[PDB]
């Protein structure tokens, strides 16, 4: 069976675990610093196997021995932002976090595929590349398929559609910036414009580049965690089955849309060998502006992780 | 448990039986004219519920009378071409099929939505809401599912990505004056022009509208059914789970695109209510010239109808 | 759509929402008397849908009024318990509670199965049957689902099979007299005594009984939700679709066993109307003196609340 | 992504290929002597693909080349039985078609696992590892899965009770002389016998016994499908996810229950590794009279075989 790695059991991890094991995409491994969590989650879940009828192994650990030859690594160690906070104001702690992980995961899974999940996002893709050593198609991040769901949810009540029709594409840094395109938002192939009166589009624009917040600021002690694991294991399917999913992940940039040696959120085709192309989308005026806005809030956020 | 009744248990409507157990939606009524048939075919799938573990009696009969009280009718009892035929060659065969199944089911269903699939679609449609006598929006056609998921694989082989990322829309009539839509057709919100050249594009556009008869020459004594089946099954879902779905179904329309007094394969938002929305698309001048003259072929499927 | 309440959204609660919602079994309304929390959870989870496919209202709320007419309610709402206690422990401040949720929430669905989670269970089932008024086999609690689900994935641990292929019936209150039942425990017809010893599979018996204690241990600071969550599904599931399941389950008795006026875990046919049938298995003298144990337990509870 | 060659694309194998795209387990190559169905069947299933969300290459040919380097073979091309006609009847016609069609396919994919349906199933398995020269446990027959499952459905219908929740054990060759075991049937680990009187239990043995004639009867063209499909499917899905499942399946016997040198319906683990234990139940003197009598059936075949 494929292995998969979990560095990292909280929210995120935990509940990635369980949208995984349903799918019984491969053994799972749910790694954490903390003694005892890792394993009461990992055997909690291991007991709904029976009712479920997955035949997947699910073990809690402490000890990144046991994540060796990981087929696929996700990485959910890092620290949560509570009501105030910007992901931005997490990049100290979780760069230490990151780094640690990281360096001690890397080395024991040489042929995974490390997907990021840590916050600020961008960044901590960046500093896991640097970290393994890896190529760069390899080392990806995940927030786009989070963000368009967001969106995508948004337009499916604002239509009164089912999400199962909706499709959207959104790209740039995970964060204030992020870059939903309107445009590129369609309906059973049918433009968002035609079905949504552009000013209630405009709110969604905006409550999508603020979703996360808007979480953090209801359940007051923690961030989101079901939709974001749910597109995690979503990443983890694609390159699992090799599904050539075309999806916005954060990937390496050499080039595409001017920008160079950074991670960013584009749209990629993500297979069995991680980011098996990034496209280039013809944006317009508006469209890269705001792109580039980003990118630059992006850059800001390298050049803090060059300090620390 | 919800009820749903299949009449004519053939090809299309067996393997209609099979996507619908396999969703656990409720329980199934296979009826047939030919004896044996039906019952055989309804148990080696009831069969096959203890290896899947779906909880849904399938009952094979040739009594109208079961089929009472369903919340469904499926009517897959028409005749199929054969290589070298066209669907609207089969409609005196199908005209009096298809009348002979509604006067019998539509009264023992009252509430239900039917969901026609004889061919020729658009015309045995009509003929079906005419001898019911019931609303014309719980009154169907599938063809547009069906049409559009062909151009759908076409375009995620072509482009070689994830079936699950592709979107488009198709209107018309379910023949050979089918209309696919390129502008109407996305990936993850992406044109697909952006994926294919439109020399690639025009020949998936004509292998759409043909897709029907390229089965036909391949299997030499019978018609597609997989695919065909999986529509109307979605279709079931629709509207049994109140789904919304945004999908081409042939319709009643009442002036939508210019188009009075005829049931055409146009965008619909489908759900517990049967056609609860009929979507009206800004079209181009080359694409209402395709349209129309596909609304051209139904009418003249119309008036044989009239003359049977 | 079918509609779900489940009362308290904390870690069951929410756990149980993600495993409905993938199920698309109707929608979700998950309330609590904590503000902001279950809007967050419900909103998060609801962001998931268009990751998954599945097309579920989940909502949040801190108002009974958005319960009304459920078919189902969940109750959720009790206080947990922390490494060193019994469920037991926590009877005067569930008690509490399960009365406040009861009292407000029946009466607004009248027609809905009460299925209680609520610690201690069999002591919880019997307070709501009696605060709700509701007919007794349509006040049912979890545990025996989850009890056996434990005891199925030890066994198939040991054996090293499916779990797919692993029943095994179990009896009593939801707690340390616990009675699992190696006769009544087969791998695809076979008995389990076939394939692990005598003394291993006493070892599985006791580690079953404290199963729950195990988790809360590795946790420390709360206790199991993925398995139970499972199996409070696995029951809604049973109702909503009519599925006539045989599990145990704390039902009320009148006689069976030779036990009468107390909810019990035993092995019932579960189905739309709720419990439709109480097995009554052959059980020897070893088993019923076991049985007798946890009866004397239970009853105890049932003391102590009448007293609270 | 893992390989599965189906050979001969007729009702089983069609079907066969239509539930193993469900589960979306690898792609699927749909092999046939006959120019063109192949092809169609394969196209119409890979079309449906964007209605279901499934990524799976389903191709059809006439060509054993594109069969190379299968994980799984499934061995459907031979002839089917029509009224009044016993599996064995088909021996000659089918041990030359089963002999044709190993001697080729089993070259190509040297480290697949060879699961035969061909009838009569024990002596065309026994020809297939004879014609293979493959590792016996790498060489099964499906048989046991279908007949139990028969077996399992009229135990569900008889007793009201959910497919999900019974299990039952069953071995012999498959044909009349089947073997199927209530005293290793349960329903969630209560036997069955607690559920159906005696005389009705012996009626549904009887009817499981003879389960396939019936539907040939009902049928009078061919034989059951979708059972037998979603058996082979189960079987194949053990292999490729190393399930480890407890089934019973025509395995090769060196001493088991008495008997040597002989494909037969016994139980077995079946995992990544085929056949990766036989299980050797403590049958009683009724059983194992039965259990003889169908053995001196099956052997009686490979008489037959052996002189053919
Ligand atoms: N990229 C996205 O779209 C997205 C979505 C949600 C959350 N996130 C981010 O993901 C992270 C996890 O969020 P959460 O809510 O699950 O947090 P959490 O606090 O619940 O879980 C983090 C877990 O990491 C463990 N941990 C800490 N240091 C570790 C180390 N060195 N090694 C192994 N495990 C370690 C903790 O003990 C804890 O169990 C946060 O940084 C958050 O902001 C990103
Ligand atoms: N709308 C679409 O997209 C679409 C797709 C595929 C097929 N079709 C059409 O659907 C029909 C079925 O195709 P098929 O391949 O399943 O055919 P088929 O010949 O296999 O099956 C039709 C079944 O109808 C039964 N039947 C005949 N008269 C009947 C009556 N009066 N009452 C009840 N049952 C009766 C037959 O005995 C037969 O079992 C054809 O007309 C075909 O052209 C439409
Ligand atoms: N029966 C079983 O098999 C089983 C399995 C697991 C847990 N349990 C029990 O289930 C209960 C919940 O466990 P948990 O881990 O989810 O706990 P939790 O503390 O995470 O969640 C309980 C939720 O109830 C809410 N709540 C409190 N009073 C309320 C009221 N009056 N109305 C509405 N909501 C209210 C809280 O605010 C909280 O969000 C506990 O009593 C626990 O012991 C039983
Ligand atoms: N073992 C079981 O439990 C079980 C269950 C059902 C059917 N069966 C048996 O399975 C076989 C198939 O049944 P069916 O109903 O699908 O039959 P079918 O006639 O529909 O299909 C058989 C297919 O084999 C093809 N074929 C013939 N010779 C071939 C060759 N040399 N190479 C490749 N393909 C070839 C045919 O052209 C045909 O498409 C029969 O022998 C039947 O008795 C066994
Ligand atoms: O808001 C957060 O911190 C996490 C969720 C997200 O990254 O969107
Ligand atoms: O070609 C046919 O007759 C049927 C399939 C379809 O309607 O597309
Ligand atoms: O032990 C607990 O409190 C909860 C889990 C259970 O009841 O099994
Ligand atoms: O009876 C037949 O020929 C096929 C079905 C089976 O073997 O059970």
């Not at 906070?85 to 640690?100: F, G, P, Q, W, Y």
């Not at 160079?260 to 192309?277: Q, R, S, T, W």
Request: charged share 20%; proline share 5%; hydrophobic share 45%.
């Amino acid at each position: 069976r494929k292995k998969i790695s979990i560095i990292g059991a909280g929210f995120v991890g935990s509940t990635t675990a369980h949208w995984l094991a349903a799918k019984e995409l491969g053994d799972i491994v749910l790694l954490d610093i903390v003694e005892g969590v890792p394993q009461g989650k990992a055997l909690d879940l291991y007991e709904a196997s029976p009712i479920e009828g997955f035949d997947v192994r699910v073990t809690g650990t402490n000890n990144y021995a046991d994540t060796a030859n990981s087929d696929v690594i996700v990485v959910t160690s890092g620290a949560p932002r509570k009501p105030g906070m910007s992901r931005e104001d997490l990049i100290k702690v979780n760069a230490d976090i990151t780094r640690a992980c990281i360096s001690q995961a890397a080395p024991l899974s040489p042929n995974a595929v490390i997907i990021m999940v840590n916050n600020p996002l961008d960044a901590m893709t960046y500093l896991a590349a640097e970290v393994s050593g890896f190529p760069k198609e390899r080392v990806i991040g995940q927030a786009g398929v989070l963000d368009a769901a967001r969106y995508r949810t948004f337009i499916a009540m604002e239509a009164g559609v089912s999400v199962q029709d909706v499709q959207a594409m959104l790209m740039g840094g995970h964060g204030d910036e992020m870059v939903p395109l309107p445009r590129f938002s369609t309906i059973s192939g049918i433009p968002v414009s035609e079905f949504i009166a552009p000013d209630r589009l405009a709110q969604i624009v905006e409550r999508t580049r603020k979703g996360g917040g808007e979480i953090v600021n209801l359940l007051k002690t923690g961030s989101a965690y079901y939709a974001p694991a749910a597109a995690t294991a979503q990443m983890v399917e694609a390159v699992l089955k090799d599904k050539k999913r075309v999806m916005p992940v954060a990937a390496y940039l050499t080039g595409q849309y001017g920008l160079n040696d950074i991670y960013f959120g584009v749209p990629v085709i993500l297979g069995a060998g991680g980011v098996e192309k990034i496209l280039e989308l013809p944006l317009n005026e508006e469209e890269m502006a705001l792109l580039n806005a980003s990118a630059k809030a992006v850059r800001a956020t390298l050049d803090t992780l060059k300090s620390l």
